[PDB]
């Protein structure tokens with residue numbers, strides 16, 4: 001009876017997105033045993049929960065089903081493909097092959113690229129560290145891009161800044177989160193002088209509340225290193241921002257001593273000043 | 277200073293026999309859930325398991341034929357090898373497959389010429405390498421490319437001179453390396469790049485003092501190493517850092533005894549194997565880099581390991597693949 | 604830089620009693636916040652159970668740091684934070700609360716008081732206020748004579764246990780943790 005109980009779950013998850021497109025995050029609910037006639041897919045407000053008792057059955061079902069598709073052992077509809085890859089990646093976003101299928105679906109015109117940015121976002125609320133999710137996301141963004149960037153781009157760039165920041169907050173010193181955020185500024189923003197300055201401002205408060213986060217502070221360094229490169233009146237404050245940074249760093253080292261991140265940060269800011 | 281505190285009742289001796297039993301009994305208990313969860317990297321998983329067994333001289337306890345058949349089934353029409361049957365090919369698991377076949381001296385089980393073609397087709401105009409046909413650029417893939425080709429004796433197939441140019445363009449001012457130009461320095465990424473430059477004979481492009489300094493800063497008062505500033509100590513990082521140090525010729529700067537005590541403290545006296553930190557979950561991943569880490573430190577009960585390929589020096593001597601390191 | 608728990612307790616001869624607490628579990632996964640909050644209540648009590656009167660201590664866990672202050676009288680105070688949050692601002696926060704707490708609540712309502720009986724709504728206000736130490740009141744009359752450098756530090760919370768005492772038996776037998784929280788710790792017994 002596991003062939004029907006599990007195939008119902010992928011519907012319950014699919015249904016949840018159609019009756020609530022404003023889902024904030026996903027999560028696992030402690031359940032050693034199922035209850036009578038209740039779906040393990042329980043949602044409260046925006047949150048989407050999955051009871052743990054079904055996971056050991058739900059995953060290998062969808063897992064093997066996708067493998068049968070890739071090996072041409074069992075056909076699936078393009079609507080079935082989207083449904084299974086969705087539930088599969090919510091359980092394990094590191095499954096590269098599952099992402100690749102969605103790449104094919106997107107590239108065939110079947111799947112809307114926006115759905116993958118959304119799917120990736122929900123996966124990062126339970127797996128903010130997941131390398132493949134970021135890797136795939138870069139491909140999706142690369143497909144959405146076929147002098148100042150357009151309004152459409154800036155709308156997406158601001159979105160990427162927020163998901164990178166939220167992922168940076170869920171896992172301490174999230175390299176893959178900040179590395180992606182940098183990638184966005186390189187390819188999407190094309191190192192825009194305005195966006196670089198705004199990111200330098202919005203992250204000041206965050207950086208002061210995460211002093212042991214070398215990745216977050218390197219992001220600061222990247223902004224500064226890129227600003228120097230772009231300048232090859234707004235561009236005048238180049239030593240001014242550098243001394244603002246060394247003051248901000250000192251103001252934290254004095255407040256919070258014993259953090260080699262803060263020291264490594266200042267140490268690198270000294271390098272930028274001396275090499276102008 | 278975030279760090280661990282090594283206890284007195286913590287293991288202070290090498291439990292070689294219990295490690296071999298752990299890897300041998302790994303996967304013996306059928307669990308469909310955990311199998312699917314990790315199948316996306318199963319090929320590398322085998323490589324970790326086999327390599328750590330051969331380092332302890334227990335490779336014969338592993339099902340040779342069953343694995344060789346598995347690898348043949350994982351090669352695709354494009355030449356690339358996937359992590360497992362059904363999964364899509366990738367450069368990572370192509371390397372792992374070749375590494376396994378080199379351990380078993382069964383390199384002709386798969387189509388070598390097509391593997392070369394697959395790897396060659398991943399290179400870009402700037403010398404960079406993609407993970408697969410979807411174009412993810414990373415220095416890991418630069419390393420995986422040349423490491424795979426070196427084991428096949430087909431390093432000439434790619435634009436070597438241009439590949440070196442891209443990797444060197446990822447070198448930051450602190451001496452370290454990232455995944456892409458403009459990335460935060462990462463010990464793991466440094467291992468890939470230093471491993472790359474070792475294979476491509478370009479170690480003279482590396483400041484051994486500067487980089488070696490950055491790497492030694494990873495060592496914490498507990499003795500363990502991390503991957504970057506203000507990170508917890510990690511057994512796997514005790515490989516990425518140590519191997520990099522050995523490559524650039526600055527291994528003697530490290531604190532052998534204190535680091536060795538940390539790695540040994542990550543053992544499980546009951547089950548066996550290594551965890552990332554003392555009192556954590558063990559896995560074949562950290563088991564390998566723990567053993568390989570002790571091997572570089574000079575543990576005599578373990579076969580000498582090559583810092584570039586993470587394989588026994590005995591195996592790489594057989595295929596005449598031993599890149600020069602900094603003396 | 605985050606504060607998780609801020610609970611005021613009491614250490615009688617028979618048992619240790621919770622009087623008033625405040626929590627901030629907004630940083631955790633949504634379907635775990637209930638379980639997490641219960642553990643922070645369990646820990647805060649357990650630390651007072653193992654700490655003597657008139658002493659300060661700071662038990663450390665990986666990525667977490669609990670600070671306890673037990674006065675000469677059996678009134679206590681526990682604050683839970685991360686590694687980043689400075690220990691001095693933590694103890695400074697503890698003292699100003701236990702002073703305002705002795706001001707409003709009588710000394711006999713302590714050994715038998717309960718969170719539903721004790722009256723103090725300013726705990727959730729202080730927890731959110733002291734979230735950023737740069738936005739905290741600079742009381743130089745307090746921290747000028749707080750430290751003695753004899754504040755016992757613990758690598759784990761096992762250092763407070765006896766030689767044969769097992770934390771596994773303390774969790775499953777606790778009456779502060781729910782059945783779903785004990786089973787949640789059982790999935791944490793698999794080393795996560």
Ligand SMILES: CC(C)=CCC/C(C)=C/CC/C(C)=C/CC/C(C)=C/COP(=O)(O)OP(=O)(O)O
Pocket residue numbers: 173174175176368416419420462464465468503507585586
């Ligand atoms: C032959 C061998 C040993 C390896 C083959 C080549 C490969 C795949 C090397 C991978 C090593 C590497 C580059 C690791 C870095 C990947 C990365 C960015 C991990 C995330 O970083 P953190 O955010 O710091 O997470 P951790 O602290 O848990 O490592």
